[PDB]
């Protein structure tokens, strides 16, 4: 499935022998979506079970500025670095852009520091505006196909500025 049936760098084709072996495998892909949190398990080689997620709604999301993480639920996907058909069909990858409820992080902020370790970070006006709106933009970083859970981080700063600039000279 991998490593053969492909012409060499010179352009000549390697004619096929040594028919496909099991250790190559190459299992079919998965498209995890929003919905009921149900997954399957796949027996990897050497009895290494893989948590294969096809439908995810909730996971963990980390504030990197504060170095914290809270369990929350995703609302929708809005961008992927890959083809737009994935974000149109509501799939999750390890570099997707999703919307996360601001309520748990806001409650944690009020409990710890207050106001609407290494504290007193002055946050930023744009994220404060997103918090007052109630929904924020954050990027999933974990691999849902392998670990079976959608974990992410809150994206802030110039990268957030670039994301909004590419989202909305703009439509």
């Amino acid at each position: 499935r991998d490593g053969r049936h492909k012409l060499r760098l010179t352009g000549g084709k390697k004619k096929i022998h040594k028919k496909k072996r099991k250790y190559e495998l190459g299992r079919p892909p998965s498209n995890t979506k929003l919905g009921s949190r149900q997954v399957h398990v796949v027996r990897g080689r050497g009895r290494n079970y893989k948590y294969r997620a096809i439908k995810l709604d909730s996971g963990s999301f980390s504030w990197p500025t504060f170095g914290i993480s809270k369990n929350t639920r995703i609302i929708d996907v809005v961008y992927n670095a890959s083809n737009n058909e994935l974000v149109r069909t509501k799939t999750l990858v390890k570099n997707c852009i999703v919307v996360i409820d601001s309520h748990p992080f806001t409650t944690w902020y009020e409990n710890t520091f207050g106001t609407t370790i290494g504290k007193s970070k002055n946050i930023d006006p744009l994220l404060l505006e997103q918090f007052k709106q109630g929904r924020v933009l954050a990027c999933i970083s974990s691999r849902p196909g392998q670990c079976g859970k959608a974990d992410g981080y809150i994206i802030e700063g110039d990268e957030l500025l670039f994301y909004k600039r590419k989202m909305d000279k703009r439509n």
Partner: protein, 146 residues
Amino acid sequence: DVQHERAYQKQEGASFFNSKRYWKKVGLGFATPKEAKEGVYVDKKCPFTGNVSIRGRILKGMVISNKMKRTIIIRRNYLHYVKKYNRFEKRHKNIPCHCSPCFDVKEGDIVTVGQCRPLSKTVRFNVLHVEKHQIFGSARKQFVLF
């Protein structure tokens, strides 16, 4: 100004706010250039900044292609002795090598290169040193014993 693709580069393993850019000296009797130490470029495949670890074989090669993006073609001229005719024989083959944007490489430049993990289907080598050399003719053409 640094990121132009339909994605973003993080330079993972660098940290942004804690502190007290990122680089790695890779050792092998070689130090990172100051330009790469201070540079604003981000590359996940650069030996100094990326995750790739250099191990295996260290070679010296002749720059053949530099117009390609972040990758160069390296040829290694050598002599192949023949037992029957007890004489030498000019024989070469060009191997691909990934070039970090830190090093400004021109055509025909001699480059020290190290082996890393398979980076592409063919590219599995990384540049470490470039020594300037104005060549005459074509890099396909000049023959160097290196």
